[PDB]
Each structure stands twice: as structure tokens, then as C-alpha cells.
Write a protein that binds this ligand. Structure first.
Ligand SMILES: [Mg+2]
Ligand SMILES: [Mg+2]
Ligand SMILES: [Mg+2]
Ligand SMILES: [Mg+2]
Ligand SMILES: [Mg+2]
Ligand SMILES: [Mg+2]
Ligand SMILES: [Mg+2]
Ligand SMILES: [Mg+2]
Ligand SMILES: [Mg+2]
Ligand SMILES: [Mg+2]
Ligand SMILES: [Mg+2]
Ligand SMILES: [Mg+2]
Ligand SMILES: [Mg+2]
Lengths: 226, 50, 245, 118
RNA sequence: CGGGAACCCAGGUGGAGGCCUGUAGCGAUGCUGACGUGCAAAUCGCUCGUAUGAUUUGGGUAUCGGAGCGAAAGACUCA
RNA sequence: UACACGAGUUGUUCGGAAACUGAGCACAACGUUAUAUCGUUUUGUUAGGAAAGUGAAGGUGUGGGCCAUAACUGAAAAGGGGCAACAGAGAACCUGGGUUAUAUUCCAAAAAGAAAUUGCAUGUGG
RNA sequence: GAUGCAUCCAAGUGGUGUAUAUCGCAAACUGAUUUCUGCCCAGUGCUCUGAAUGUCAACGUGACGAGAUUCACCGACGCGC
RNA sequence: ACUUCUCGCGUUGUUCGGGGGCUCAAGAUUGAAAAAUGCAGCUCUCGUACUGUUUGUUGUGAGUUCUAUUAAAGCAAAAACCUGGGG
RNA sequence: AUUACCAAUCUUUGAACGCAAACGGCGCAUGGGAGAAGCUUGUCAUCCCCGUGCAUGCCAUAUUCUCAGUGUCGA
């Protein structure tokens, strides 16, 4: 019938109880955890905090919808596009090869920056995380310098899948065709309600100082002693 | 005495052979400069230690 | 001149503890989950004699809480502990003479040997033969016990340290006089290499600050400064009270 | 959540593709000859090497030094189509490896030294 | 154990000991012996110290140059 | 014991290694250093991801499974290797005898014999 | 009393006593028993102490000059006592 | 069990004292090896044959025997191997 | 044929790099080639040769060759 083992203290050899939390993880495993907790502890300045108040999933998928359908041509529709720029030009009489990129979003970084400085980017999308964080830290600040609606969005790996690369620091969505002025004209509104309307409280917003659940439930069990 | 490595054995064998006299067909050669062996070791005089 | 015997000793070349006939380091069982939220029984099976120590070392086996083995622990033996005593070393452990129940849970005014300063270092204090500590005070608001070390110097340790109950074995070793240089030879041949002690005043004034002269005299006062450099810090180091009382 | 039932993290057993078995690091030709003529190099004729052909059935070949008692037998059989039972060897005080070779008591040794021309 | 209300008188047993004599071993006191162009760039003879021990010894192994190591002679570290 | 010439050292079992650990050593890693040839290093290494020993489904001759090798996966399993003892550990052979010089080494078939022993095999015993 | 003491190392999460834990370690002195071990803390040493005892180090503070600089001051632990 | 007893040359065992058994390691023994060996004398003449193929006693010793005594000295470690529990 | 010159052969080592090392020692793969007992005249058992590969570090890289992470995110 039954055999009952009490894996109590000292009374029987337990089963293979999952440890996976008190084990010695390899260096990078702990070190990438101690990294995302250390920058929750500290007093995050009001300029770096900006990237931990991203859009919500409500319009983030919509923002990735535009960036996706206005994504560049994938080295195959690029090389056969400029090929019809010779096929129908070699048959053309002369002086007519005129072709350009059909319509896409400015997806580089130094190409995006110029889309802002020119004020030709209608609105820009910015990535939550880039390894040299300073590489895009200033991006949400020359926007309200040039009054472009900006958008700090939750993952650069999700600005890559839409475009086509692996990662993307910031996408700029410049002039669009009248098939889709409806969906973005609201996106600009749905996002500056989160970044430009908030410009005052953003630049005065010290983040972090988020204590543990271990060392701040302790600070709950002592106001329980009050 | 009885333990010598084979490598140390190969090196004393290469010395037992080098300890033979110049053969008497060498000193009738046209212009040699050899009359004696002048590298003959005697086991008592000088030791090899290898 | 040359370096002095004392300075010429932290190189630890020849003057290094021998420990070949020694057993492992004798210390309490590792402070795992079992010795915090309960106890675990352990049988004393063998009481050996680590060469170079007056206290008996008792081989205590416990069960490994997690694997199926029987982990074996080498501990210093409190006096009275015999082979087959079923020692308990945990939280809820009883306080018989040999158990390792935690220090802030032992009753006050009690007698504890093999106490440990830090909570986990597996027993440091009161661990030579016949030595022990008396628990004086618990401070449950601070959570730290003040026990009286076997030197008079009474300190405060945390109330979660562990501690055996009793006196370390081999008490009364230091009272049987040696009567001969040969019984001091065999004492230190299990211990390190410091015997015989040549008096520095019988040395040459190249090998020691005292040596020299036509008479064997310390030329300058033996009491040397606390701050004095090594090779000079010889004699009575920072002696604050000097000579026969 | 992956189940780790260990205090350590031991490296995961990933896929392990085999090597490619590179073609060769040489071109130089080989044969069946050089494998059997390098070992047994020349027989030996002495007062003791003769006394052991007639009295015993052994032979004496000054085999090369880095040979093998199992490969002196193979070499005999490949060179002198005779069987070899006991192949005693010794690296002489000349760096030269001698070899005594019993001929199975069925191949007379005195009928090989006369064939081999010893 | 014998023999007589305390624990002495003796009889053995046993075989301890940095105990004694002494061989080897290890030392080197005396002869200020003999050698001192040696046998010998420190040896020889006799005497002598010790000889269960803090002993002697083999191999391995550690520590070396303004340093090592020393029961300490500034001894020893390939004459 | 010189000189010359010629010879002379034979092993499943003896010694050594393959194959133990000791005092100890120190490759790696890691650290340090202008610099290393430095230091740590089994009473178990390393900020530290340090390994086929096994068990398996599937693949394969063939009347779709009888049966069988094999591939390539991958089952738990903490504590990297590695030296260091011809006196420690370990170690399967004993007599008899016929070299100018070797023999527990050599002896050939009335092995001069007699054993032990390792590897792989066929097969009588269940 | 171990975040110790003594000590090594060119430096290092290095090393030695320490596989140790004051019946221990390190450092001196005298030299078995027995017998005593006197007086002197001025000195020079160790040692604490520092409130006030007297004084100092860059640093920090001030004012000066256009500025290099000047004049200070904090007299601070230490060092005196 | 009224203090008895069993001890060893000896410092101790019982709280076990005899009758049989079970093993244990020394060790003997018969038998194989093994007598054609070997030592060897021989009658005769490497041939040639056969006639003898002997154990008991002592003493000293090396190991076995009993993991006393100096011990603030307690008198190495490991592989391989072995057995068992679970199998 | 000798001499001179200009494709090979090029042992054991050594930076030495499979591991070691006063071991002409020891492996792991991987072929092929001897030798044989069994066995079906040949075929691969351990045994034994020959050859290649196998050191660490680093760089590149792999048609989507495998993976780890309470790093990031999302279905
Ligand atoms: Mg990292
Ligand atoms: Mg001096
Ligand atoms: Mg002085
Ligand atoms: Mg290829
Ligand atoms: Mg004498
Ligand atoms: Mg030797
Ligand atoms: Mg000669
Ligand atoms: Mg190194
Ligand atoms: Mg063992
Ligand atoms: Mg190398
Ligand atoms: Mg490449
Ligand atoms: Mg993958
Ligand atoms: Mg993950």
C-alpha cells in the first residue's frame, strides 16, 4: 500500500529537492542578477530613470505595428528594387532611372539622430535598454528640444524583429503614406501623453531606492511592533 | 650498478664504440692530420657520469 | 646583520607545524539547516589522539542530511564523552555533557567548551585541553551572550553561536612536570619546530638584539615598543606591567 | 524553472560533434617490405651464436633496437618461413638489440643458418 | 607473598631507566704520541667519551646568499 | 683492472614501469607583477560552467516480429589534471642441469621439469 | 580572544606559528630540587592617561593682494606632562 | 556466594567452572611433485650396471605467539583487493 | 661513376603541443596490416606494430551545430 517517508528534519533522506536558489551559479549568472538588483537599490538619477518608465503593452504593439509594416527592404527586395532601376531603365530611352526607398522608418542611430535634428522624424521610438546606456541616454532629451514626440519602448530586441535586425537602439518614423496617418496620429498622442506631457515630472524623478522583499518586509514587521 | 635508464645506456654504448683506435688504413691517406685517436677515454682516468 | 630567529620563522620553511600523524582539523559539524531548525543525533565511535594535542579528538559520525551517506565529523572531545554516546548538536538539542545546542539557548551560568565566536566557524574558543568558558549574561534584546573565556578576558558573542557542554578532555596536562629535556623533545616533535630555545642573550650581536658583550647581558631595556619593527620587537613586547608581581 | 538538485552548477551536457578525421599528414609511400626488413637486420656469428644453432634450435639476429619480441616472430615468419617460439632479446653494450630465436623444434636451425648463409 | 588491633620485617616475581660495564655504531680526552716534502690539503696509534637513546644511519623531501640553518662555536651551507 | 683483438648481459612470473599513496612538488586556472620563469595549489584546485564509467528508444541480416552487433544520442554522479618510494604499499616460479664470461633469464618434446597466473576464445556442468 | 598576536612577501581573495584557540601561540630572561630572591620608577626604556594640562603635521577655515603669494587660523589626534 | 576460583616466566581473568562441538593460524602427517633428480660410492670394466638413499636428540636463533613498558611520544597514508547491506 | 650546384627523404627529442618522464614508458580516437586461435579457404578476439588526430590561450566561424542565465522581453 502506502510507504510514508517523512522528509522532516533529520528523519529521512529527502528526494531531489530543487535547490536552484542556494546553489553556486556560474559567475555571469549571479553577476547579471546582482546587476539588475543593484540598479534598483541605488538612487537612480532623473535622467537615467527615464528608461524605466516605458510605454505600456497597450499601444506598444501598435507602435511595433507601424515600425513593422514600414520596415526597410531585406537585402532581397533591395537588390531587386534597384535592379528594376536598370531593367526598366536600360529599356528606357534615357534620363529616367529615378527610384528611391518606397517608404520606411529611419532605423539606424546616426540616421535617426539626423531625423530629429532636421525635425523631419514625425516621432521617434527609443529602446528600453542598450549596453552602453549612454548611447541612447540623450535621445529622449533632444526630442523635447526639437519637440518630436518620443517613445521609450520596452525592448530593443522587439525593435529588431519588426525592422529585421537583431536589436535596434531607436526607430524613427518619418513621413508616412495616407494609408496610415490615422493609426500613428493617435500613437503620437498616446505616447506624448506619457513622455512629452510628463516632461516636467520626468526631469525631476529620482528612481530606485526599491528595497528587498526580505529586508523590507523586516521593515514591515517592526511597524507591526508599533 | 644495475639500474641505468635505457637512454643513459644508449649514451655509454655510444662511448664504448668511440673508444676504439684509429684503424691502420687512415694514416696512409693522402693528407690526413691524424696519427693518434686523442679522444680515447680510460674508465679510471676520466669519468663520463652520464 | 642577519635576520633573527623569530623574524626568520614566518617564512615557515622548517619552522612549520608538522601534522603528519595528525587527524583532520578538529571542529564542530558544519552549520547547515539541520543544526538551526532542529537537532540531529550523532554517535561517538572513536576517540583518538592527534599527535601534538593534549585533548582527545572524538570521531563523531552524523548522517548526511541530504545524500545517503554517513558523514563523519572530527570534534574535540569534552571530558566524560565516551564511545557510543549519541551526541545531539542542533537547535532543540538537549543539554547533556557533550551536546552542541546553541549558545544563546544554553542556560546561563553554565559551563561550555569548544564555543565558537562567529556563528558558523565550527568552534574556535575554549578548545585546548581542560579549557572552557562560563556563560555569564544573555542579552536577548541584542541577541548576544557574554561568556567568560578561559583567560579571564570575558567577551560578548552572538546568541546563535554553537558550543559543546563540558570541559575539554586531557585536563591537568600542564601540571605533571617534564623532569627531563627528552620529554620536551617528544612534546614538540608532534608540535612545530621550536625547541630548544637558545637565549638571545647567548647569541652573537648579528643574530639577535640582545646578543653580544663580554658578559651575557641585555644591553638596553628588554621591554620593546608595540610599534617597533620586526627583528627588533624582541623580548617583552609592549610590556605594560613588568617583572615579578 | 529548471530543476537543479545540486549545490553547484556543473556544465550542461551539450552536443559534441566528432572530429573530421583529417586525410593524412604525410605522402611518403610504405609497403610490406620495410615493415619486416627493418626489424631483423642481420644474423650473428660468434662462438656462442654458433653453439646455440646446433645444440639448441635458436638463431641470433642483431635486430634493430626499438623492435618488439612479438614483431621479431612476425618478421622471422615473414622473412624466414619458420616458426619462432621463444624470442629472447637484449640491448647489448653497443646499443644493438640481439635476439635469440627458438625455431619451434620443427624447423631445424642448422637448416636455416645453412640457408640464410650464416 | 610468607609472618604479627595500625601497617613494618623479610622471600621471590617482574625487568623500568635521557642508569652502569661493554661490541658495533657514533664521537675525539690524553699522549700536547707518531707523521708534519703525510698514507692523509687533518691521517695513524694507543688511550678515551657515549653506546634504548634529546641516539646512529640510508634514500626521499623541505630552507641558501645583503640568505639559509644553528642544544649558538658568528658554527655550517661541495676543501 | 694495462695494450690489442674477439666475445659476453636471454625473463608472462625477478627489479622497474604500466597501476598506490608519504614528506613534498606545481601544470592549469586565477592572482600579482614594468617583468616573470612569482604565488596559491590533496588536512583536495578555480568568481568557480574543469568528466562516458552505465542505462536506453531508435537503426540494422532475414520467412512483420523472432534473435544481434553497431551508431549516435545521453542516467544520476561535486570537488581539474598530474608527478614524487629500485628500502613504505604493491608484486602470478620453483627446484634439477647442459657458459671461456649470463641465468629464479638459458634447457624442447621420455619441454630438465613442475607450478601459478592475465587476456581472449571455443566448448562439458547448471 | 582571530578583523588577535608574532611574522614572511616585490605584490597579491598571498604565506608562517595556525590541522592551532589562552592547560594555546608567540617573546624574553634565569637555569634542577631545596633556600631565599632586599631596597631604588630619579634616569633612560615599556606602559596607560590626556579634562582643561604645553605644543604641533598637511588637510579644512578665514582675511590680504589682480594674482602668484602673504598673514593667519582649526590646534586637531599625536608629542609634552 | 561459605569468596571463591581460571591463570601466565609476568604485570589478571571471573560475578567464566568441566563434557562434546564450531571454526582460527601456525605446524606436523600421509599422498602427489619425487626420483629416472641430486650427493655420491661401487662390481666391473664417457659407454656398463646396480647394491645405501636414515632418522632421531639438544642449543641458539630469525618469524609465529600475547595490537607489557617510555609516553604532555600512543607509535603513516592510499590504491588495488575483500566481504556485506540495498539488489 | 665523381664533382659541382638545385624536388625529395629527413630517426629520438626540443617552442614540443595526448599524458608523463633518470620510463626510449602510457593512453584516447582513427583508419590499415600483420599474426593467429577459434571459425567460414579465408574472416577480425584481445595480444602487437604503422600512421594520422588529440596541449593550453586567442581570433574567426558554424544552411536556424548544441546549450546556460529568478539578464531583457514576448507569444
Ligand atoms: Mg561578469
Ligand atoms: Mg643588532
Ligand atoms: Mg636595542
Ligand atoms: Mg574533408
Ligand atoms: Mg668505544
Ligand atoms: Mg636509491
Ligand atoms: Mg683496455
Ligand atoms: Mg609557475
Ligand atoms: Mg581506506
Ligand atoms: Mg609540456
Ligand atoms: Mg575563418
Ligand atoms: Mg540552438
Ligand atoms: Mg532566461
Amino acid at each position: 500500500a502506502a510507504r510514508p517517508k517523512n522528509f522532516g528534519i533529520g528523519q529521512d533522506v529527502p528526494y531531489a529537492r530543487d535547490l536552484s536558489r542556494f546553489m553556486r551559479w556560474p559567475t555571469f549568472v549571479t553577476m547579471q542578477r546582482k546587476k539588475r538588483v543593484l540598479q534598483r537599490r541605488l538612487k537612480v538619477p532623473p535622467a537615467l530613470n527615464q528608461f524605466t518608465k516605458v510605454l505600456d503593452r497597450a499601444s506598444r504593439n501598435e507602435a511595433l505595428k507601424l515600425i513593422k509594416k514600414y520596415a526597410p527592404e531585406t537585402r532581397k527586395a533591395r537588390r531587386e528594387r534597384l535592379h528594376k532601376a536598370a531593367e526598366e531603365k536600360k529599356k528606357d530611352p534615357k534620363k529616367t532611372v529615378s527610384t528611391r526607398a518606397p517608404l520606411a522608418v529611419v532605423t539606424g542611430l546616426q540616421e535617426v539622430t539626423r531625423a530629429i535634428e532636421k525635425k523631419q522624424a514625425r516621432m521617434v521610438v527609443i529602446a528600453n535598454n542598450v549596453d552602453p546606456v549612454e548611447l541612447v541616454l540623450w535621445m529622449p532629451n533632444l526630442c523635447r528640444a526639437n519637440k518630436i514626440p518620443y517613445a521609450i519602448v520596452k525592448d530593443m530586441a522587439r525593435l529588431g524583429d519588426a525592422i529585421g535586425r537583431k536589436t535596434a537602439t531607436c526607430v524613427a518614423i518619418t513621413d508616412v503614406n495616407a494609408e496610415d496617418e490615422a493609426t500613428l496620429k493617435n500613437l503620437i498622442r498616446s505616447v506624448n501623453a506619457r513622455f512629452l506631457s510628463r516632461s516636467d515630472v520626468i526631469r525631476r524623478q529620482w528612481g530606485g531606492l526599491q528595497l528587498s522583499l526580505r529586508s523590507r518586509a523586516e521593515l514591515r514587521k517592526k511597524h507591526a511592533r508599533n | 650498478g644495475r639500474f641505468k635508464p635505457l637512454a643513459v645506456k644508449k649514451k655509454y654504448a655510444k662511448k664504448m664504440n668511440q673508444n676504439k683506435p684509429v684503424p691502420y688504413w687512415i694514416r696512409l691517406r693522402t693528407g690526413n692530420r691524424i696519427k693518434w685517436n686523442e679522444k680515447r677515454r680510460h674508465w679510471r682516468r676520466t669519468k663520463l657520469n652520464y | 646583520g642577519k635576520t633573527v630567529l623569530s623574524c626568520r620563522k614566518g617564512n615557515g620553511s622548517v619552522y612549520q607545524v608538522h601534522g603528519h600523524k595528525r587527524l583532520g582539523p578538529a571542529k564542530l559539524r558544519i552549520l547547515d539547516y539541520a543544526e538551526r531548525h532542529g537537532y540531529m543525533r550523532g554517535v561517538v565511535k572513536s576517540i583518538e589522539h592527534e599527535a601534538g594535542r593534549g585533548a582527545a579528538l572524538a570521531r563523531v559520525e552524523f548522517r548526511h542530511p541530504y545524500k545517503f551517506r554517513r558523514v563523519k565529523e572530527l570534534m574535540v572531545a569534552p571530558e566524560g564523552m565516551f564511545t557510543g554516546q549519541s551526541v545531539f548538536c542542533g537547535q532543540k538539542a538537549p543539554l547533556a555533557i557533550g551536546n552542541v545546542l546553541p549558545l544563546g539557548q544554553i542556560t546561563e551560568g553554565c559551563i561550555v567548551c569548544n564555543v565558537e565566536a562567529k556563528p558558523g566557524d565550527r568552534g574556535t574558543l575554549a578548545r585546548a585541553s581542560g579549557d572552557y568558558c562560563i556563560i555569564i549574561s544573555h542579552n536577548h534584546e541584542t541577541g548576544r551572550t557574554r561568556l567568560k573565556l578561559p583567560s579571564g578576558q570575558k567577551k560578548s558573542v552572538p546568541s546563535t553561536s554553537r558550543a559543546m557542554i563540558g570541559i575539554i578532555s586531557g585536563g591537568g596536562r600542564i601540571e605533571k612536570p617534564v623532569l627531563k629535556a627528552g620529554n620536551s623533545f617528544y612534546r614538540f616533535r608532534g608540535k612545530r619546530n621550536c625547541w630548544p630555545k637558545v637565549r638571545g642573550v647567548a647569541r652573537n650581536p648579528v643574530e639577535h638584539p640582545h646578543g653580544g658583550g663580554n658578559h651575557q647581558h641585555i644591553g638596553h631595556p628588554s621591554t620593546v615598543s608595540r610599534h617597533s619593527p620586526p627583528g627588533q620587537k624582541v623580548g617583552l613586547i609592549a610590556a605594560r606591567r613588568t617583572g615579578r608581581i | 524553472r529548471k530543476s537543479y538538485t545540486r549545490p553547484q552548477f556543473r556544465r550542461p551536457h551539450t552536443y559534441r560533434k566528432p572530429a573530421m578525421a583529417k586525410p593524412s599528414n604525410r605522402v611518403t609511400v610504405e609497403s610490406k617490405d620495410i615493415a619486416a626488413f627493418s626489424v631483423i637486420r642481420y644474423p650473428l656469428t660468434t662462438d656462442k651464436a654458433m653453439k646455440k644453432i646446433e645444440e639448441n634450435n635458436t638463431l641470433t639476429f642483431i635486430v634493430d633496437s626499438r623492435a618488439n619480441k612479438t614483431e621479431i616472430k612476425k618478421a622471422m615468419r615473414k622473412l624466414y618461413q619458420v616458426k619462432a617460439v621463444k624470442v629472447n632479446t637484449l640491448i647489448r653494450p653497443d646499443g644493438l638489440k640481439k635476439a635469440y630465436i627458438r625455431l619451434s623444434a620443427a624447423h631445424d636451425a642448422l637448416d636455416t643458418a645453412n640457408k640464410i648463409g650464416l
